[PDB]
Coordinates of N, CA and C in Angstrom, one line a residue:
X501 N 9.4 -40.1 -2.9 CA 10.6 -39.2 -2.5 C 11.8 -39.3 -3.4
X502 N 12.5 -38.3 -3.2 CA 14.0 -38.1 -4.1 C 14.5 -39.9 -4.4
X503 N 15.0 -40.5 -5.1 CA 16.0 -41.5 -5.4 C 17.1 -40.8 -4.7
X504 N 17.8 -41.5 -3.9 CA 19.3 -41.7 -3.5 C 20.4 -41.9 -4.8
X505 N 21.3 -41.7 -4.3 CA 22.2 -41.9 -5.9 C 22.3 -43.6 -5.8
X506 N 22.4 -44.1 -3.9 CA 22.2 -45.5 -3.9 C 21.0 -46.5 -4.8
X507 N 20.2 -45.8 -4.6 CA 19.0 -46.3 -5.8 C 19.2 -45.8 -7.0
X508 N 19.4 -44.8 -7.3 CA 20.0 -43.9 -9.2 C 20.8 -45.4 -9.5
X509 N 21.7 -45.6 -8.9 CA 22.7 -47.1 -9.5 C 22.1 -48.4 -9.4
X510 N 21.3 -48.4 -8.1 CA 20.5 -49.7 -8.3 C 19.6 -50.0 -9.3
X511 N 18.6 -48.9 -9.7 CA 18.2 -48.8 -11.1 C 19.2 -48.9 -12.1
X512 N 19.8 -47.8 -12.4 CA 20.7 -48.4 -13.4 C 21.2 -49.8 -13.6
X513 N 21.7 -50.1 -12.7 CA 22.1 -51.5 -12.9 C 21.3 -52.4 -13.0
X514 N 19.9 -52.6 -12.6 CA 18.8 -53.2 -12.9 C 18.7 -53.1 -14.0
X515 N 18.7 -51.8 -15.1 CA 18.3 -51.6 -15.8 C 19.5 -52.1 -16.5
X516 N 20.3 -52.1 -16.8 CA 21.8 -52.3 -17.6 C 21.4 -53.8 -17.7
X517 N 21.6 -54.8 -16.4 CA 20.8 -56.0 -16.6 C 19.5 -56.6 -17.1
X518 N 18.6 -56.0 -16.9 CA 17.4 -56.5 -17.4 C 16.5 -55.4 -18.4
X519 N 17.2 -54.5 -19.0 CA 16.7 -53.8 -20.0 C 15.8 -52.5 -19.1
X520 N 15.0 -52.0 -20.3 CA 13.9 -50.7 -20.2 C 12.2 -51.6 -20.1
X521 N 12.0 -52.7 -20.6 CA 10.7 -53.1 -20.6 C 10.3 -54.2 -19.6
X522 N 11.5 -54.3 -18.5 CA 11.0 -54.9 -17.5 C 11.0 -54.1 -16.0
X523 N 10.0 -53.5 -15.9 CA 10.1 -52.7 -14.7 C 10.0 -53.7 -13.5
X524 N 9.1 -54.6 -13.5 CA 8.5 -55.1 -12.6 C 10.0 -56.4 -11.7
X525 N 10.5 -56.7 -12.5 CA 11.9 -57.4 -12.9 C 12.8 -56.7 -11.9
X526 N 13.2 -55.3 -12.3 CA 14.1 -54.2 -12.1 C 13.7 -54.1 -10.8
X527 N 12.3 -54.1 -10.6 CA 11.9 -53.2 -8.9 C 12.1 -55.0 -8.0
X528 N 11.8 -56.5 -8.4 CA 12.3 -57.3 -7.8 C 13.9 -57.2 -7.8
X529 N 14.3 -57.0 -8.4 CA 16.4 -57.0 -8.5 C 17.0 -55.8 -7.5
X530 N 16.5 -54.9 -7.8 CA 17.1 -53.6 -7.0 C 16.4 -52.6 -5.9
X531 N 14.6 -53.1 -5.8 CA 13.9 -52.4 -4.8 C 12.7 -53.1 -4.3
X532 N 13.1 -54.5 -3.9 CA 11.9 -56.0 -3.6 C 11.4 -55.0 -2.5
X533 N 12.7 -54.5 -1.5 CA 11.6 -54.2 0.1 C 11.9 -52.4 0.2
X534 N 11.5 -51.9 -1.2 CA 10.9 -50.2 -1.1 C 10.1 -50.3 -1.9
X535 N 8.6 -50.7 -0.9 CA 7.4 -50.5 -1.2 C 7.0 -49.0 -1.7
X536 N 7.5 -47.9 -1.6 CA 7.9 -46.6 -2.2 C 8.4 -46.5 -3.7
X537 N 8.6 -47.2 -4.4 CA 9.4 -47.6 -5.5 C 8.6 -48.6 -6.3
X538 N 7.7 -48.2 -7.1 CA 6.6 -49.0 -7.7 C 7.9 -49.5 -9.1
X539 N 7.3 -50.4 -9.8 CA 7.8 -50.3 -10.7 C 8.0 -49.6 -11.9
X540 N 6.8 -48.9 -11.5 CA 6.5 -47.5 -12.3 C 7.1 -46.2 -12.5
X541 N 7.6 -46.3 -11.0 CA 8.2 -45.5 -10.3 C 10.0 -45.7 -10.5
X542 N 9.7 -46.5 -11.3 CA 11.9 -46.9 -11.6 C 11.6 -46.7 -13.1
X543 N 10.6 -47.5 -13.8 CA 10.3 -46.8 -15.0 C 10.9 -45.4 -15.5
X544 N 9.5 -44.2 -14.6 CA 9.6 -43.0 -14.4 C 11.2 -42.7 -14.3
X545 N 11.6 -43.1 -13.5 CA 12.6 -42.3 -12.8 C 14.0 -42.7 -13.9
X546 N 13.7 -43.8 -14.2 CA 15.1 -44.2 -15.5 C 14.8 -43.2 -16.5
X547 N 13.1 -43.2 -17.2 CA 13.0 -42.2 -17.8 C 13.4 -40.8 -17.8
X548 N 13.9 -40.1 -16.7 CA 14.2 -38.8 -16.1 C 15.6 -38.9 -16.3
X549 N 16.0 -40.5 -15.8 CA 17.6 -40.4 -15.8 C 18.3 -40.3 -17.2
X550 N 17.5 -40.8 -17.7 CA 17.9 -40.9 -19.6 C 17.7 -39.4 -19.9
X551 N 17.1 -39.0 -19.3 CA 17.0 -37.2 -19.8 C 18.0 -36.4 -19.0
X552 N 18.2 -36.5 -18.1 CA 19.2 -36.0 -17.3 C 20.6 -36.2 -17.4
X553 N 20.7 -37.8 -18.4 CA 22.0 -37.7 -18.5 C 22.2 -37.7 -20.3
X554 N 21.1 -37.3 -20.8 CA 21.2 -36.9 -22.4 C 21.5 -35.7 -22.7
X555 N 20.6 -34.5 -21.5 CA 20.8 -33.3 -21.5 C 22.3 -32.6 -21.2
X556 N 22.5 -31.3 -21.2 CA 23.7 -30.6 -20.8 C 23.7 -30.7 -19.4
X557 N 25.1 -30.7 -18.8 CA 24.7 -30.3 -17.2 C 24.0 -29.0 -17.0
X558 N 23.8 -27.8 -17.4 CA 23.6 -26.8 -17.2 C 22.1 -26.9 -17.3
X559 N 21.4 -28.2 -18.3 CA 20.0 -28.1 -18.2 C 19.7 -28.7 -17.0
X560 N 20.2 -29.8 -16.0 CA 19.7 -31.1 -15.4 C 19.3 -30.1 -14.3
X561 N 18.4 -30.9 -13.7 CA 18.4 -30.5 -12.3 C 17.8 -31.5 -11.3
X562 N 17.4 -31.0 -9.9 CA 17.2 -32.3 -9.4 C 18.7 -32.4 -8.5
X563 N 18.9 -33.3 -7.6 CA 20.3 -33.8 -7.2 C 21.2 -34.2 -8.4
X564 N 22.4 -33.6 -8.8 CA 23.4 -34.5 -9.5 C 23.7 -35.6 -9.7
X565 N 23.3 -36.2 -10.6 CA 23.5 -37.8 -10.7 C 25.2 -37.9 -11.0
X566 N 25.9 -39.0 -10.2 CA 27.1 -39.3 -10.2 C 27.5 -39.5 -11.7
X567 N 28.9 -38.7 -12.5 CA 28.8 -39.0 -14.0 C 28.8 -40.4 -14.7
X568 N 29.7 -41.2 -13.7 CA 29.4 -42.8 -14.1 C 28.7 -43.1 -14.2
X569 N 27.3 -42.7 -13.6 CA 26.0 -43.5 -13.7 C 25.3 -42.7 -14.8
X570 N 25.7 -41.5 -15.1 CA 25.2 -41.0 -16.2 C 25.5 -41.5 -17.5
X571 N 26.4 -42.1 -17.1 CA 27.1 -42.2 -18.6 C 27.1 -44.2 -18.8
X572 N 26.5 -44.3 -17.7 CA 25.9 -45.9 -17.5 C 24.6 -45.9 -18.0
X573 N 24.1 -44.7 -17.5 CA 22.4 -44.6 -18.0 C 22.5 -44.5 -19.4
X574 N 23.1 -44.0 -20.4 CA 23.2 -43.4 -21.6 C 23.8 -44.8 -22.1
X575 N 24.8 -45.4 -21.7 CA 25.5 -46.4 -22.1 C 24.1 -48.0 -22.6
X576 N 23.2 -48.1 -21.0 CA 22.6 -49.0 -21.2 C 21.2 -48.6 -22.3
X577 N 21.0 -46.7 -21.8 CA 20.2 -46.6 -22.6 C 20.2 -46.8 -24.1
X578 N 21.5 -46.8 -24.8 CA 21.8 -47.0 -26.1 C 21.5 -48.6 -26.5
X579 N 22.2 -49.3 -25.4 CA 22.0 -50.8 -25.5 C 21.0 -51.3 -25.9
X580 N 20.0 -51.1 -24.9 CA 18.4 -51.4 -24.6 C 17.7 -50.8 -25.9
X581 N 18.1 -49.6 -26.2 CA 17.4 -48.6 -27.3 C 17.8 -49.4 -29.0
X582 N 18.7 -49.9 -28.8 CA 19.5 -50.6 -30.2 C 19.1 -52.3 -30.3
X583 N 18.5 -52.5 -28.5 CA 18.1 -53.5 -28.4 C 16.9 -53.8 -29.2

């Protein structure tokens, strides 16, 4: 089902802390008890978030990700990506 914007940041910040190549890591740190939330599934969904918040608003769709976190996702994405 949809991510919450409460999970959008928990990932992110998973992700901001422990990179893009540790899913498994990320889904212990920010989703141990949403058996719904594989780690594949934060993978995926960071993956979407990095597109969602690379794209124009006019392209995104989906729920509106809060701009902070977009611009957290872009932020760590650069990080991780330079990493």
């Amino acid at each position: 089902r949809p991510f919450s914007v409460a999970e959008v940041e928990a990932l992110v910040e998973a992700v901001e802390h422990l990179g893009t190549g540790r899913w498994r890591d990320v889904k212990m740190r920010a989703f141990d008890n949403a058996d719904h939330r594989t780690y594949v599934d934060l993978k995926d969904k960071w993956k979407t978030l990095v597109h969602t918040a690379s794209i124009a608003p006019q392209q995104r769709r989906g729920e509106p990700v809060p701009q902070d976190l977009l611009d957290r996702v872009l932020a760590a994405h650069a990080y991780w990506s330079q990493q």
